[PDB]
């Protein structure tokens, strides 16, 4: 399949994430995450891959909301996407743990790798946001991942 399939499936959530009735957007986001999962399952995508995808999507959206001024004090902070879908509260470390595993089998996981690259260049920081020297280290991650994607042709 095409390496952009998971990016394509996530485009409504990327737009949604970029502009962040708070209650409203919260609920539409929960519904859309599940709808995307169902759509990709129908297309025959592997459950384990879809759970890694969903995990990263949740962490991405949560970080987008926690970056705002109203985020940490809103209903979203109280019960985040990652908490509702994966029963975890941050995701900032585990996104990169997942990335490292996927990079152990990169041809197999090309589409999810491409998705993670897109998240990174859209500004996802995770653990790098609060790491000393984190901005430079994150740029090294992005450079390595671009090189990997390039080597997968």
């Amino acid at each position: 399949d095409n390496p952009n399939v998971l990016i394509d499936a996530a485009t409504p959530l990327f737009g949604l994430s970029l502009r962040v009735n708070i209650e409203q957007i919260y609920r539409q986001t929960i519904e859309e995450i599940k709808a995307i999962e169902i759509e990709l399952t129908e297309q025959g995508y592997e459950h384990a891959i879809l759970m890694a995808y969903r995990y990263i999507l949740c962490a991405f959206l949560d970080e987008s909301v926690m970056g705002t001024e109203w985020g940490a004090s809103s209903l979203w902070a109280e019960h985040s996407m990652l908490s509702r879908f994966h029963n975890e509260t941050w995701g900032g470390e585990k996104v990169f743990t997942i990335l490292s595993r996927l990079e152990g089998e990169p041809h197999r996981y090309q589409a999810l790798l491409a998705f993670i690259y897109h998240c990174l260049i859209l500004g996802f920081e995770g653990k790098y946001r609060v790491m000393e020297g984190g901005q430079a280290e994150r740029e090294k991650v992005i450079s390595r991942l671009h090189q990997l994607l390039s080597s997968l042709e």
């Binding site: 384990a48 891959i49 759970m51 890694a52 995990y55 585990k94 743990t97 997942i98 595993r101 996927l102």
Partner: peptide, 5 residues
């Protein structure tokens, strides 16, 4: 499971 530890 890719989302383990």
């Amino acid at each position: 499971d890719l989302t383990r530890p």
